[PDB]
mmCIF file of N, CA and C in Angstrom:
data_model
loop_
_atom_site.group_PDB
_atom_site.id
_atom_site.type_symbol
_atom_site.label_atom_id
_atom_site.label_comp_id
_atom_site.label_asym_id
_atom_site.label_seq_id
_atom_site.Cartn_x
_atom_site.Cartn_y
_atom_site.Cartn_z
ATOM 1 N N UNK P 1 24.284 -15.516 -10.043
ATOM 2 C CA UNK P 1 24.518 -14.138 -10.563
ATOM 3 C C UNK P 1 23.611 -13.155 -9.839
ATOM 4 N N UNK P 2 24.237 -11.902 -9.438
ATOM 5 C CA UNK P 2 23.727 -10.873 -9.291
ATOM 6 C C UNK P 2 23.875 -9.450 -9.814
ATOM 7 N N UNK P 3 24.313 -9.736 -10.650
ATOM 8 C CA UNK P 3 24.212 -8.772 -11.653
ATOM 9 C C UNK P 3 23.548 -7.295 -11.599
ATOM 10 N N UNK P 4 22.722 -8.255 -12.206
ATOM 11 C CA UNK P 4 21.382 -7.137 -12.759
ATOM 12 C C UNK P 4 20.838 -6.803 -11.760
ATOM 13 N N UNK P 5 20.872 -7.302 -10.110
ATOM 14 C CA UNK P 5 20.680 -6.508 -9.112
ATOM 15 C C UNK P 5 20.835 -4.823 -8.896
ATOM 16 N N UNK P 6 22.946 -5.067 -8.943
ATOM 17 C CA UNK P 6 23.215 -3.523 -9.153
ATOM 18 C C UNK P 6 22.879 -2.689 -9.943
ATOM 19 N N UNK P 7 22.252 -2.963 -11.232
ATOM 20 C CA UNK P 7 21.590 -2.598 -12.127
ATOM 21 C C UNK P 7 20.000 -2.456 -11.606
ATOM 22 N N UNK P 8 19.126 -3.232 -11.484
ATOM 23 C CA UNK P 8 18.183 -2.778 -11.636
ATOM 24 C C UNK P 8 17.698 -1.780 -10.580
ATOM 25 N N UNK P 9 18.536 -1.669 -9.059
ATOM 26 C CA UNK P 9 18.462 -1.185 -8.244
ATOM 27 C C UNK P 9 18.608 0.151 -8.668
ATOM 28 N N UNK P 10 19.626 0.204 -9.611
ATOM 29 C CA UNK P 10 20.198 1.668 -10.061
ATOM 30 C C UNK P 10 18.936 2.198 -11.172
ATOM 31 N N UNK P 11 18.404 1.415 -11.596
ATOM 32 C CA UNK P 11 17.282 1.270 -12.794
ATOM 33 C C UNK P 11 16.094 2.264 -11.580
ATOM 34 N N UNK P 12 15.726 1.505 -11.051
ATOM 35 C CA UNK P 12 14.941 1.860 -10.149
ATOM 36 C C UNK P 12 15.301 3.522 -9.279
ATOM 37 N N UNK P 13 16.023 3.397 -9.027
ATOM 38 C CA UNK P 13 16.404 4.853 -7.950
ATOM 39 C C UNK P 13 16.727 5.731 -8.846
ATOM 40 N N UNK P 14 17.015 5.903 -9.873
ATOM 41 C CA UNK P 14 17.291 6.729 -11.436
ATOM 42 C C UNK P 14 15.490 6.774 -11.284
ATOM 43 N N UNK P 15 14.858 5.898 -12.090
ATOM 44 C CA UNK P 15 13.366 6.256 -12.364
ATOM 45 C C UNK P 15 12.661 7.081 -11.317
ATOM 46 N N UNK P 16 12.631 6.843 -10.305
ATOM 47 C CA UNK P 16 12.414 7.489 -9.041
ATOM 48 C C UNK P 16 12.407 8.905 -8.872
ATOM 49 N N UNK P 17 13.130 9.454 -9.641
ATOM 50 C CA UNK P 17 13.562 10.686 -10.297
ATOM 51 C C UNK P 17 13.354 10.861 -11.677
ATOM 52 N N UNK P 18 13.408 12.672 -12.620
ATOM 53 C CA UNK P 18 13.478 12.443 -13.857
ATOM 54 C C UNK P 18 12.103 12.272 -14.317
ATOM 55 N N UNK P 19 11.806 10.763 -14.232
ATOM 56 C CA UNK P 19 10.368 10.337 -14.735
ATOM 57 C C UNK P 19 9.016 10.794 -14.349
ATOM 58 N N UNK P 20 8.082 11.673 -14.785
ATOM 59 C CA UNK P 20 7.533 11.974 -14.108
ATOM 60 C C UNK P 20 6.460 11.581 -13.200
ATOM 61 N N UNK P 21 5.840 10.674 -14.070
ATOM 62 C CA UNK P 21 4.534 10.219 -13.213
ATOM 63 C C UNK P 21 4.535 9.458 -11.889
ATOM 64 N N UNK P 22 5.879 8.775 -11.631
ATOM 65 C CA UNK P 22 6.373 8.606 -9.652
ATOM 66 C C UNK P 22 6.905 9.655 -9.094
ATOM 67 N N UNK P 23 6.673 10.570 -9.744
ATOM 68 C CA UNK P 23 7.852 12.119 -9.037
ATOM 69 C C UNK P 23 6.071 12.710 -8.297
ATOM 70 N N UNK P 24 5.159 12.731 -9.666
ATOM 71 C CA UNK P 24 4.066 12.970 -9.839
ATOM 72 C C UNK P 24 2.833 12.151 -8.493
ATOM 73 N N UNK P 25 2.872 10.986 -8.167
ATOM 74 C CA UNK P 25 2.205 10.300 -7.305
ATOM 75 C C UNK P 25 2.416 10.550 -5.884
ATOM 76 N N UNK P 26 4.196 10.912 -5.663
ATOM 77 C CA UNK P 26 4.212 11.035 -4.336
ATOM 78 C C UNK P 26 4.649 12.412 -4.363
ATOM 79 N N UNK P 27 4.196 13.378 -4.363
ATOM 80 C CA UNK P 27 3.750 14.997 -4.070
ATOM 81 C C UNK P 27 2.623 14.791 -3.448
ATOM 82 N N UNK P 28 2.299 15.520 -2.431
ATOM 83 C CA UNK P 28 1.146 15.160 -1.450
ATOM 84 C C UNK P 28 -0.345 15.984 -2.738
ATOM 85 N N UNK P 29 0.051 17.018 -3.801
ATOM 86 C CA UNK P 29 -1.237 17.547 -4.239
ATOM 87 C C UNK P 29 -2.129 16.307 -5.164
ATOM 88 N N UNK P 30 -1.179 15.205 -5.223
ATOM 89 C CA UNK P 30 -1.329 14.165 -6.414
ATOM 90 C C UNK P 30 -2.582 13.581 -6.409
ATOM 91 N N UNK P 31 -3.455 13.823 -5.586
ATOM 92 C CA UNK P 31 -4.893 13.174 -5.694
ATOM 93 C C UNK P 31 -5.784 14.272 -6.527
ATOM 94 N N UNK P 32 -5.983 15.052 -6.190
ATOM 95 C CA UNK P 32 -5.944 16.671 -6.475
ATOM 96 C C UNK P 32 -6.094 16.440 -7.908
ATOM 97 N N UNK P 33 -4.507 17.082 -8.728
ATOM 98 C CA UNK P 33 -4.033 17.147 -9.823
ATOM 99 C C UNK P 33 -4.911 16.345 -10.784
ATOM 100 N N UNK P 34 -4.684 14.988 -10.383
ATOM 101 C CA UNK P 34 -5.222 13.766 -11.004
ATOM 102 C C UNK P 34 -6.285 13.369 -11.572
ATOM 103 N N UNK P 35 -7.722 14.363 -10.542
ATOM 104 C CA UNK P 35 -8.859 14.082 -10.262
ATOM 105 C C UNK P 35 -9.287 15.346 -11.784
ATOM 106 N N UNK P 36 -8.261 16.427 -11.160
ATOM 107 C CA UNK P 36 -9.129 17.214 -12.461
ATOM 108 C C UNK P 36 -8.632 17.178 -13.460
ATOM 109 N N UNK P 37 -7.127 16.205 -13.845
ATOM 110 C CA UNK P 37 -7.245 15.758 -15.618
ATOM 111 C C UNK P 37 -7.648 15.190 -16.091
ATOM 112 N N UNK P 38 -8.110 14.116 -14.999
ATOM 113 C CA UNK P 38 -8.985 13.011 -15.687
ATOM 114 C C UNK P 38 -10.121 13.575 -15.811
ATOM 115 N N UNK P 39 -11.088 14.187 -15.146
ATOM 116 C CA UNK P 39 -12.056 14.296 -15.501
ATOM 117 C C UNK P 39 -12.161 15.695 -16.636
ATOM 118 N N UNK P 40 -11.108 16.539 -16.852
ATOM 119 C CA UNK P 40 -11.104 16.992 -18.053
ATOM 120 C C UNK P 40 -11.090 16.492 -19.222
ATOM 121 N N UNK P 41 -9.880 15.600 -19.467
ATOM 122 C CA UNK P 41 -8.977 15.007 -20.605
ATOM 123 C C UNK P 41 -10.133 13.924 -20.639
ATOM 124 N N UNK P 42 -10.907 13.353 -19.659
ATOM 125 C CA UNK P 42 -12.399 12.480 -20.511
ATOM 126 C C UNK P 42 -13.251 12.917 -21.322
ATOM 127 N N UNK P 43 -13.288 13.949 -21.775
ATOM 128 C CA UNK P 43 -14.313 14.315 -22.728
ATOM 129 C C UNK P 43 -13.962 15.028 -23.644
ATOM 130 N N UNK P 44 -12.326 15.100 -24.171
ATOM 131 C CA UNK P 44 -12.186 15.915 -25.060
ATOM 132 C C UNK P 44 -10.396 14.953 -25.757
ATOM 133 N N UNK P 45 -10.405 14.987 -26.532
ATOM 134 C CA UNK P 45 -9.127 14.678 -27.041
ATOM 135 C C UNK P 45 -8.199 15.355 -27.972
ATOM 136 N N UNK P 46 -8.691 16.235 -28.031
ATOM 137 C CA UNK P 46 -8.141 16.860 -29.100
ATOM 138 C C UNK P 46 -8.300 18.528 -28.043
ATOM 139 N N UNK P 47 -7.661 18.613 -27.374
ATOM 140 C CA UNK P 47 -7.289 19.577 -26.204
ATOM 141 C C UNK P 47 -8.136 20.522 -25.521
ATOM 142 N N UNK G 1 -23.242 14.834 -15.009
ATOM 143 C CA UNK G 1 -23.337 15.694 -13.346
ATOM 144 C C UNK G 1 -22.134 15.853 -13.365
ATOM 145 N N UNK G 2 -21.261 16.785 -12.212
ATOM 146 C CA UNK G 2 -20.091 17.357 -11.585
ATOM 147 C C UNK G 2 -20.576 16.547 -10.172
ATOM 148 N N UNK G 3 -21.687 15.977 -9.666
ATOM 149 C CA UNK G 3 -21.547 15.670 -8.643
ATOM 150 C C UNK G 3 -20.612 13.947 -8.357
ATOM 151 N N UNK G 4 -20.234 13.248 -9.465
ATOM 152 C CA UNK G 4 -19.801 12.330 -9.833
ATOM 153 C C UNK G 4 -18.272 12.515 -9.404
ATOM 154 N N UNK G 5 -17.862 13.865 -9.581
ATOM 155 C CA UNK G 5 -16.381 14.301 -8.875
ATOM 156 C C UNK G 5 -16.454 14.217 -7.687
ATOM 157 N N UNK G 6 -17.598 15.340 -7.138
ATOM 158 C CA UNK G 6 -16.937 15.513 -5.650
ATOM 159 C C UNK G 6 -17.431 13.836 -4.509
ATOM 160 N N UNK G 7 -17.998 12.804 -5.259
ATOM 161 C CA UNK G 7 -17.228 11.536 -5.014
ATOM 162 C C UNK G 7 -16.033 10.852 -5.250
ATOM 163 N N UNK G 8 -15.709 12.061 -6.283
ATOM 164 C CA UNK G 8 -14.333 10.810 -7.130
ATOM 165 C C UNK G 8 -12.875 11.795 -6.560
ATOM 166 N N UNK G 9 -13.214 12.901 -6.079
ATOM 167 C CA UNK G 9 -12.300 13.709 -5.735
ATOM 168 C C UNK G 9 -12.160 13.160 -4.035
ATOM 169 N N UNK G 10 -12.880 12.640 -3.693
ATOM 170 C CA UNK G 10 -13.059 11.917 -2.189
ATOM 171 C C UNK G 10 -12.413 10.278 -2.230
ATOM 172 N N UNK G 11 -12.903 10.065 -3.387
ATOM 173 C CA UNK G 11 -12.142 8.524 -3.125
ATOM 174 C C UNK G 11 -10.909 8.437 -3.531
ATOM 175 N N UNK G 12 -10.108 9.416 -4.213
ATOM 176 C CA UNK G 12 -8.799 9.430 -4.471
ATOM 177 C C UNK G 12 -8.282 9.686 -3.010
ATOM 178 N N UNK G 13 -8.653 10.718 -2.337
ATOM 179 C CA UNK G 13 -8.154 11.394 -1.319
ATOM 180 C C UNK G 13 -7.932 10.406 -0.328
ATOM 181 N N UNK G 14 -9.012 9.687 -0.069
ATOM 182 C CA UNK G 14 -8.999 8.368 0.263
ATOM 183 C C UNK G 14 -8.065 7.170 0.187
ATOM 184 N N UNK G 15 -8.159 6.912 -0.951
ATOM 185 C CA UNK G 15 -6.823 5.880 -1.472
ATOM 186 C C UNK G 15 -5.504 6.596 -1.010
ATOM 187 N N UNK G 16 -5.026 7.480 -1.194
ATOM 188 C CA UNK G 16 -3.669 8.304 -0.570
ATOM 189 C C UNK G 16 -3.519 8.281 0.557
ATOM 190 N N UNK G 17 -4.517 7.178 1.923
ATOM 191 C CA UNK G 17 -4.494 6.828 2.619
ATOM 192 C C UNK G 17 -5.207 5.464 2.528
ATOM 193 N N UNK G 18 -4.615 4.793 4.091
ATOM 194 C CA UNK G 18 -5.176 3.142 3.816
ATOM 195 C C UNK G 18 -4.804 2.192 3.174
ATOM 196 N N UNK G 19 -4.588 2.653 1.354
ATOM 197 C CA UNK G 19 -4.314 1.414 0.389
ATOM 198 C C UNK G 19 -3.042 1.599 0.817
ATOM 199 N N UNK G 20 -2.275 0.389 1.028
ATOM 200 C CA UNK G 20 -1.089 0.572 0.525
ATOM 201 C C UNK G 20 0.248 1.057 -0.324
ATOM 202 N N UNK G 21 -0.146 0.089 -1.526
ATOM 203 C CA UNK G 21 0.491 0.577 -2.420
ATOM 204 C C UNK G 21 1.122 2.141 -2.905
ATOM 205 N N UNK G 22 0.087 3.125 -2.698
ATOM 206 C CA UNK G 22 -0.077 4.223 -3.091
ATOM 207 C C UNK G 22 0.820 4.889 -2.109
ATOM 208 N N UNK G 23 0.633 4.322 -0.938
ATOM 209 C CA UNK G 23 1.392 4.827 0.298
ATOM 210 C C UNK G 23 2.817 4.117 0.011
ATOM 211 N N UNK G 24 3.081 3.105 0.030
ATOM 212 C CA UNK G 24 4.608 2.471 -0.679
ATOM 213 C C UNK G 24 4.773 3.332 -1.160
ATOM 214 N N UNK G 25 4.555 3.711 -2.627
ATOM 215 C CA UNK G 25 5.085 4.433 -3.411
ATOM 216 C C UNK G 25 5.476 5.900 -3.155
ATOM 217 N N UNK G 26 4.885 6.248 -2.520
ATOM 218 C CA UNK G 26 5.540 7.878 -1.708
ATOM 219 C C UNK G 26 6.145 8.189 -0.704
ATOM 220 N N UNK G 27 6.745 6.677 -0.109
ATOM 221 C CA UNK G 27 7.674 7.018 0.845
ATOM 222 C C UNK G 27 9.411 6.614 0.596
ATOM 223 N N UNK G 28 10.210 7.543 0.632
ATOM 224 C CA UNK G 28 11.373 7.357 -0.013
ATOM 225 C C UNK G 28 12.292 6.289 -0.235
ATOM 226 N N UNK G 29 11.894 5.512 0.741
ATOM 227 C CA UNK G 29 12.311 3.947 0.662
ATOM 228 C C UNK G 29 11.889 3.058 0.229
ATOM 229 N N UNK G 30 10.644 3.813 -1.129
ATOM 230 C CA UNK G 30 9.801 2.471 -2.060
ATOM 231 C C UNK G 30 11.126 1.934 -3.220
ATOM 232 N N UNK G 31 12.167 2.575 -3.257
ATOM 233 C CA UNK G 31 12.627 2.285 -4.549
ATOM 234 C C UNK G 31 13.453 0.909 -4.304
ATOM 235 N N UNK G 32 14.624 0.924 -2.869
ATOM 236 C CA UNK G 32 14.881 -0.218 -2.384
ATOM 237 C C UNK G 32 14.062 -1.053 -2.141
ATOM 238 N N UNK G 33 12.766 -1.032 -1.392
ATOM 239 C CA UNK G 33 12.132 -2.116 -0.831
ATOM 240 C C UNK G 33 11.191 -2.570 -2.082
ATOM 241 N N UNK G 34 11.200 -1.959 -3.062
ATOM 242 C CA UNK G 34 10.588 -2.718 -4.549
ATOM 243 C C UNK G 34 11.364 -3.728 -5.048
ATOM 244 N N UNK G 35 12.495 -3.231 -5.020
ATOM 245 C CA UNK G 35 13.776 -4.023 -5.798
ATOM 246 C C UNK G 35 14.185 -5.248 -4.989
ATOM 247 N N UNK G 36 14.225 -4.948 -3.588
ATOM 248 C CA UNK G 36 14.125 -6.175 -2.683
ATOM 249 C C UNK G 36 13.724 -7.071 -3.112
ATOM 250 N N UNK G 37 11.786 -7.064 -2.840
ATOM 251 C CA UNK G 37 10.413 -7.923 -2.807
ATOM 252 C C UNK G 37 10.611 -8.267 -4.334
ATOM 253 N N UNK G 38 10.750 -7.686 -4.927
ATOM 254 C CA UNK G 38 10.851 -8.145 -6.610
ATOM 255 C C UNK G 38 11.878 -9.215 -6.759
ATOM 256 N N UNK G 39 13.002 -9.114 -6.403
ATOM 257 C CA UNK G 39 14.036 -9.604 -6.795
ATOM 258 C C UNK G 39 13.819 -11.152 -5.720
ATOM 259 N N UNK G 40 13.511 -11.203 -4.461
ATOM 260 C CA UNK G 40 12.818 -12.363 -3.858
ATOM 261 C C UNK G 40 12.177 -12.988 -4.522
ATOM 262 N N UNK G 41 10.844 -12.431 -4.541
ATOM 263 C CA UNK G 41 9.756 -13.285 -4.898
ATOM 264 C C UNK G 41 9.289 -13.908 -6.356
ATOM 265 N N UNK G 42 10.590 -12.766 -7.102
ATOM 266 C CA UNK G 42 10.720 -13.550 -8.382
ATOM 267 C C UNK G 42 11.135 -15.616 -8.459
ATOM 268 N N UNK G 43 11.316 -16.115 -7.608
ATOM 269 C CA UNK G 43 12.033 -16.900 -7.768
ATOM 270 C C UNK G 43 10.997 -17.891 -6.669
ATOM 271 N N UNK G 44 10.074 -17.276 -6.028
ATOM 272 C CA UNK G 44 9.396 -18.919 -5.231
ATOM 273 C C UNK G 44 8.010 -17.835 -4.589
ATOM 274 N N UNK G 45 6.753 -18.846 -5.011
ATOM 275 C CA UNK G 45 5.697 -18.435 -4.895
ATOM 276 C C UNK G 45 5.216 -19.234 -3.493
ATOM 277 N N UNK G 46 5.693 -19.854 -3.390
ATOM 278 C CA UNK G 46 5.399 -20.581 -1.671
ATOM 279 C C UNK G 46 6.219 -20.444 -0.660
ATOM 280 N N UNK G 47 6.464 -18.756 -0.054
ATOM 281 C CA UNK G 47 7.369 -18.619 0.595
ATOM 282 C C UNK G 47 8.380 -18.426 0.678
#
Protein backbone atom coordinates (compact mmCIF):
# COMPACT_ATOMS: atom_id res chain seq x y z
CA UNK A 1 0.00 0.00 0.00
CA UNK A 2 0.64 3.45 -0.78
CA UNK A 3 -1.87 5.15 0.21
CA UNK A 4 -1.21 7.39 2.75
CA UNK A 5 1.71 8.47 0.63
CA UNK A 6 -0.69 10.65 -1.56
CA UNK A 7 -1.98 11.75 1.52
CA UNK A 8 0.64 12.53 3.61
CA UNK A 9 2.51 14.24 0.84
CA UNK A 10 -0.62 16.38 0.47
CA UNK A 11 -0.58 16.56 4.48
CA UNK A 12 2.71 17.96 4.22
CA UNK A 13 2.61 20.62 1.24
CA UNK A 14 -0.92 21.91 2.76
CA UNK A 15 1.09 22.44 6.24
CA UNK A 16 3.80 24.13 4.44
CA UNK A 17 1.38 26.80 4.04
CA UNK A 18 -1.54 28.23 6.32
CA UNK A 19 0.37 26.98 9.43
CA UNK A 20 2.28 29.36 10.76
CA UNK A 21 5.31 28.55 12.51
CA UNK A 22 7.05 26.78 8.97
CA UNK A 23 5.67 29.80 7.00
CA UNK A 24 7.37 31.58 10.12
CA UNK A 25 11.05 29.71 10.05
CA UNK A 26 11.69 30.11 6.47
CA UNK A 27 11.23 34.05 6.06
CA UNK A 28 14.77 35.11 6.06
CA UNK A 29 13.75 37.83 9.34
CA UNK A 30 13.07 34.44 11.39
CA UNK A 31 16.16 34.50 13.55
CA UNK A 32 15.44 38.08 14.34
CA UNK A 33 11.68 37.76 15.24
CA UNK A 34 12.42 34.74 17.38
CA UNK A 35 15.26 36.08 19.39
CA UNK A 36 13.10 38.99 20.66
CA UNK A 37 9.96 36.84 21.72
CA UNK A 38 11.71 34.66 23.39
CA UNK A 39 13.54 36.74 25.25
CA UNK A 40 10.44 38.87 25.96
CA UNK A 41 7.70 36.20 26.51
CA UNK A 42 10.61 34.70 29.22
CA UNK A 43 9.83 36.80 31.85
CA UNK A 44 6.38 37.59 31.74
CA UNK A 45 3.26 35.42 31.12
CA UNK A 46 0.61 37.09 31.54
CA UNK A 47 1.48 39.70 28.55
CA UNK B 1 22.13 41.28 31.53
CA UNK B 2 20.87 42.14 27.78
CA UNK B 3 24.34 41.14 27.01
CA UNK B 4 23.15 37.37 27.08
CA UNK B 5 21.12 38.42 23.72
CA UNK B 6 23.50 39.98 21.70
CA UNK B 7 25.11 36.29 22.03
CA UNK B 8 21.87 34.65 21.55
CA UNK B 9 20.84 37.00 18.74
CA UNK B 10 24.31 35.76 17.07
CA UNK B 11 23.86 32.18 17.55
CA UNK B 12 20.49 32.05 15.99
CA UNK B 13 21.85 34.00 13.08
CA UNK B 14 24.27 31.45 13.01
CA UNK B 15 22.20 28.34 13.02
CA UNK B 16 20.20 29.89 9.82
CA UNK B 17 23.38 28.94 8.41
CA UNK B 18 25.57 25.68 8.58
CA UNK B 19 22.97 23.52 10.59
CA UNK B 20 21.16 21.86 8.34
CA UNK B 21 18.01 21.21 9.26
CA UNK B 22 17.03 24.81 9.61
CA UNK B 23 18.35 25.26 6.14
CA UNK B 24 16.11 22.06 4.87
CA UNK B 25 13.37 23.60 6.15
CA UNK B 26 13.46 26.92 4.16
CA UNK B 27 14.10 25.72 1.01
CA UNK B 28 10.99 24.99 -1.06
CA UNK B 29 11.68 21.51 -1.71
CA UNK B 30 11.72 20.56 2.16
CA UNK B 31 8.14 19.43 1.91
CA UNK B 32 8.82 16.59 -0.83
CA UNK B 33 12.19 15.62 0.31
CA UNK B 34 10.68 15.17 4.06
CA UNK B 35 8.01 12.97 2.86
CA UNK B 36 10.53 11.05 0.76
CA UNK B 37 13.29 10.36 3.72
CA UNK B 38 10.33 9.73 6.07
CA UNK B 39 8.47 7.46 4.16
CA UNK B 40 12.03 5.37 3.37
CA UNK B 41 13.51 5.22 6.39
CA UNK B 42 10.45 4.44 8.16
CA UNK B 43 10.84 0.92 7.28
CA UNK B 44 14.87 -0.12 7.67
CA UNK B 45 17.41 1.37 9.99
CA UNK B 46 20.44 -0.36 8.27
CA UNK B 47 20.30 1.17 5.03
Amino acid sequence: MEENTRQRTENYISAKNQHPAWILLATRRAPLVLSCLKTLFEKSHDG
